[PDB]
Design a protein around this ligand. Structure first.
Ligand SMILES: CSc1cc(-c2sc(-c3cccs3)nc2C)[nH]n1
Length: 184
């Protein structure tokens, strides 16, 4: 049902301009805040990578992977194929650390490029998400802005005392810059 979303993305997101670009980030970030609020996440990271991809990482429990009873498809796929961010992203990747394992799947405009598969072992838990906005949609600007992301990270941490939130800009490879907030 993400096919409508790439037709009238105005209800879902509101304006395809620069402010709609930065709202993708708060979508994913909301999820890690949930994991914090439930009592399992305490650490969260945001990076703007080269070519303006975006990476969010937390140490919560990891998205559920168990197979569902309606179609035999994993929980994590059923969930992402309903994601606004995923629909309006031209590429998107996910890594999950769960059951002592590292699972992985990868999309185009919300269409799964292959079945969830196992790619390693772990003794951690958590989720990683990387995505790259669909330019044919966000015509105007595909460049993120540090100050804007930075101000909002700072309010979120002050709103969630005890939780370490970090931002980093890796676009200028020779000059890497970082801020980390952790209110007692
Ligand atoms: C950074 S994206 C992300 C997604 C999630 C989780 S954790 C979860 C769980 C549901 C039930 C038990 S853990 N669901 C999602 C979507 N955390 N971080």
């Amino acid at each position: 049902g993400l096919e409508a979303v790439r037709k009238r993305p105005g209800m879902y997101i509101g304006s395809t301009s620069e402010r709609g670009l930065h709202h993708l980030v708060w979508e994913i970030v909301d999820n890690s805040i949930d994991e914090a609020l439930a009592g399992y996440a305490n650490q969260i990271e945001v990076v703007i990578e080269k070519d303006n991809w975006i990476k969010v990482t937390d140490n919560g429990r990891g998205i559920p992977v168990d197979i569902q009873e309606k179609m035999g498809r994993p929980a994590v796929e059923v969930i992402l194929t309903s994601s606004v961010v995923n629909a309006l992203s031209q590429d998107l990747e996910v890594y999950v650390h769960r059951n002592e394992t590292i699972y992985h799947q990868a999309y185009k405009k919300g269409v799964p490029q292959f079945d969830l598969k196992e790619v390693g072992t772990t003794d951690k838990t958590g989720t990683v998400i990387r995505f790259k906005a669909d330019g044919e949609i966000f015509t105007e600007t595909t460049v993120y802005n540090y100050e804007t992301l930075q101000q909002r990270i700072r309010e979120l941490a002050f709103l969630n005392k005890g939780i370490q939130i970090t931002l980093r800009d890796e676009r200028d490879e020779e000059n890497v810059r970082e801020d980390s907030y952790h209110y007692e």
